[PDB]
Enzyme design. Structure first.
Site, PDB file in Angstrom:
ATOM      1  N   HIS A  40      47.836   1.204   3.552  1.00 39.03           N
ATOM      2  CA  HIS A  40      49.006   0.763   4.333  1.00 39.03           C
ATOM      3  C   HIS A  40      50.185   0.269   3.462  1.00 39.03           C
ATOM      4  CE1 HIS A  40      47.562  -3.533   4.518  1.00 39.03           C
ATOM      5  NE2 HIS A  40      48.861  -3.762   4.632  1.00 39.03           N
ATOM      6  N   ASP A  84      41.311   1.785   4.617  1.00 37.65           N
ATOM      7  CA  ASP A  84      42.586   1.268   4.111  1.00 37.65           C
ATOM      8  C   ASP A  84      42.529   1.070   2.583  1.00 37.65           C
ATOM      9  OD1 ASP A  84      45.153   0.336   4.006  1.00 37.65           O
ATOM     10  OD2 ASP A  84      44.747  -1.625   4.936  1.00 37.65           O
ATOM     11  N   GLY A 175      52.337  -9.735   2.692  1.00 42.79           N
ATOM     12  CA  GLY A 175      52.760  -9.761   1.294  1.00 42.79           C
ATOM     13  C   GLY A 175      51.591  -9.812   0.327  1.00 42.79           C
ATOM     14  N   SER A 177      48.931  -8.041   1.110  1.00 39.41           N
ATOM     15  CA  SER A 177      48.344  -6.721   1.390  1.00 39.41           C
ATOM     16  C   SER A 177      48.129  -5.896   0.132  1.00 39.41           C
ATOM     17  CB  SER A 177      49.254  -5.923   2.316  1.00 39.41           C
ATOM     18  OG  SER A 177      49.239  -6.460   3.628  1.00 39.41           O
ATOM     19  N   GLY A 178      46.968  -5.254   0.050  1.00 44.14           N
ATOM     20  CA  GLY A 178      46.645  -4.411  -1.096  1.00 44.14           C
ATOM     21  C   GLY A 178      46.026  -5.160  -2.256  1.00 44.14           C
TER      22      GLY A 178
HETATM   23  N1  LIG Z   1      44.278 -11.985   6.272  1.00 45.01           N
HETATM   24  C1  LIG Z   1      45.215 -11.853   7.207  1.00 45.01           C
HETATM   25  N2  LIG Z   1      45.269 -12.671   8.170  1.00 45.01           N
HETATM   26  C2  LIG Z   1      46.199 -10.730   7.077  1.00 45.01           C
HETATM   27  C3  LIG Z   1      46.284 -10.066   5.853  1.00 45.01           C
HETATM   28  C4  LIG Z   1      47.170  -9.012   5.689  1.00 45.01           C
HETATM   29  C5  LIG Z   1      47.986  -8.613   6.736  1.00 45.01           C
HETATM   30  C6  LIG Z   1      48.901  -7.474   6.489  1.00 45.01           C
HETATM   31  N3  LIG Z   1      50.110  -7.462   6.852  1.00 45.01           N
HETATM   32  O1  LIG Z   1      50.841  -6.346   6.548  1.00 45.01           O
HETATM   33  C7  LIG Z   1      52.248  -6.476   6.365  1.00 45.01           C
HETATM   34  C8  LIG Z   1      52.562  -6.878   4.945  1.00 45.01           C
HETATM   35  O2  LIG Z   1      51.636  -7.398   4.147  1.00 45.01           O
HETATM   36  O3  LIG Z   1      53.694  -6.731   4.515  1.00 45.01           O
HETATM   37  C9  LIG Z   1      47.904  -9.258   7.968  1.00 45.01           C
HETATM   38  C10 LIG Z   1      47.003 -10.324   8.138  1.00 45.01           C
END
Ligand SMILES: N=C(N)c1ccc(/C=N/OCC(=O)O)cc1
Ligand SMILES: [Ca+2]
Length: 223
Positions: A40, A84, A175, A177-178
């Site tokens: 993603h 993912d 932020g 993410s990944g």
């Molecule tokens: N652990 C969580 N609660 C969590 C972790 C990652 C996300 C991902 N968001 O995607 C948009 C971005 O990162 O820009 C959402 C919730």
């Protein structure tokens, strides 16, 4: 990272920032030429930034290397976030040292209850927005598969696991993410999804890296 701590400069030497004119995702260095991140996080024009602590200041230990190719998992489903995971190949090999280092891939899957290290430059608030300068860290346990499924009925596949705190207050976030989830010195998870961040009964959901070692190995052996 919500409810975490300041890691300390270069104490997470496999942590990378993906940059497209701005930081937008984390990733993990798995050898001198390859980074594992979330599918993603895919976009064109990625620059991989290694050796970072403050992402807004050049502090002297950075290596900025452009991606030459990005390979999203062949079965990645952006709707469900099943599979993912993505590999990013660097245009030139990183110079490996104390501050820039690879993280081992797992040979076996991690255990429920194991405390893992999650890190990133993501949002530090569970409501509202505040983005940190320096790398943030969180120690969080892997949750049982049954509690994970209970938290997200109908949404958790065998390629996902939950980690964190059902009480809320501590989690990864937008932020992050990944980025890495490292357990017992192995890259076991990738920051993937969750309902909000640090919300009660809504723990973090992470890509289950141990399921992808064969694909990773074959892909890097051929690209
Ligand atoms: N652990 C969580 N609660 C969590 C972790 C990652 C996300 C991902 N968001 O995607 C948009 C971005 O990162 O820009 C959402 C919730
Ligand atoms: Ca920097």
């Amino acid at each position: 990272i919500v409810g975490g701590y300041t890691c300390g400069a270069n104490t997470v030497p496999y942590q990378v920032s993906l940059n497209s004119g701005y930081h937008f995702c984390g990733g993990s260095l798995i050898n001198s030429q390859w980074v594992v991140s979330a599918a993603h996080c895919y976009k064109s024009g990625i620059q991989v930034r290694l050796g970072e602590d403050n992402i807004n200041v050049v502090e002297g230990n950075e290596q900025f290397i452009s991606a030459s190719k990005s390979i999203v998992h062949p079965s990645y489903n952006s709707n469900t976030l099943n599979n993912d995971i993505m590999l990013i190949k660097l245009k030139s090999a990183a110079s490996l040292n104390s501050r820039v280092a690879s993280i081992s891939l797992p040979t076996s899957c991690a255990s429920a209850g194991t405390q893992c290290l999650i890190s990133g430059w993501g949002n530090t608030k569970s409501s509202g927005t505040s983005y940190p300068d320096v790398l943030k860290c969180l120690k969080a346990p892997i949750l049982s598969d049954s509690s994970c499924k209970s938290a997200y009925p109908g949404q958790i596949t065998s390629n996902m696991f939950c980690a964190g705190y059902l009480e809320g207050g501590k989690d990864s976030c937008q932020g992050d993410s990944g980025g890495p989830v490292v357990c017992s010195g192995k890259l076991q998870g990738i920051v993937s999804w969750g309902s909000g961040c640090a919300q009660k009964n809504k723990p973090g959901v992470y890509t289950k890296v141990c399921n992808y070692v064969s694909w990773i190995k074959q892909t890097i052996a051929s690209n």
